[PDB]
Design a binder for this molecule. Sequence first.
Ligand SMILES: OC[C@H]1O[C@@](CO)(O[C@H]2O[C@H](CO)[C@@H](O)[C@H](O)[C@H]2O)[C@@H](O)[C@@H]1O
Ligand SMILES: OC[C@H]1O[C@@](CO)(O[C@H]2O[C@H](CO)[C@@H](O)[C@H](O)[C@H]2O)[C@@H](O)[C@@H]1O
Lengths: 97, 94
Amino acid sequence: NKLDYIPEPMDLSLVDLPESLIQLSERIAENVHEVWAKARIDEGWTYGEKRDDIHKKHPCLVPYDELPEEEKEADRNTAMNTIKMVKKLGFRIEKED
Amino acid sequence: DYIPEPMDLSLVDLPESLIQLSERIAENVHEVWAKARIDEGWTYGEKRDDIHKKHPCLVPYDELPEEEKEADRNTAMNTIKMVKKLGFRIEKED
Ligand SMILES: OC[C@H]1O[C@@](CO)(O[C@H]2O[C@H](CO)[C@@H](O)[C@H](O)[C@H]2O)[C@@H](O)[C@@H]1O
Ligand SMILES: OC[C@H]1O[C@@](CO)(O[C@H]2O[C@H](CO)[C@@H](O)[C@H](O)[C@H]2O)[C@@H](O)[C@@H]1O
């Protein structure tokens, strides 16, 4: 092996987010996916049952609801980790009156 | 037949103190992403290979092409703009 890289993510296990926000994690993940998909469809990518760099085919190029549950969980957790980092970095997150 | 329509976040204002920390946020999402692939047997290779589990982005975040860091930063900021658009205050604690 040539490269010796060990990822060390920040410990966000004890960062608490409003329950109201976590209740919306699907809403956030869905929009993240829409942004992702629009960027790939604008580059000529299309849906295909196997990923393919040469023919620009991706299986995840579907509406968010049609994704496998495993893939939605990923998207929801990515979203929550990105926000937990905001809180870890010293910002308050509060639902507006 | 499927047309993505992301929320219009063009007018959502985030505190400048936070946008300054884009790279810290982007760098951590990359670490979590990288940690998950390496735990499943992925390694760095300069071409992506779904078969030998080789990905060119399995490098320290600072070693990424600027185009890739730029993508990660914008992704992080759109996720946080969604929070603000969904009715949440984001303010630095002083
Ligand atoms: O485990 C899947 C992995 O993909 C990520 C990339 O950060 O999500 C992006 O790519 C997905 C398909 O590969 C899209 O469905 C998703 O919308 C997009 O944000 C992570 O969320 C996840 O860890
Ligand atoms: O594939 C690039 C594409 O994936 C995103 C998530 O949608 O970033 C993820 O994948 C990157 C490597 O491909 C990682 O560096 C990053 O941390 C991870 O979240 C997009 O930002 C990017 O356009």
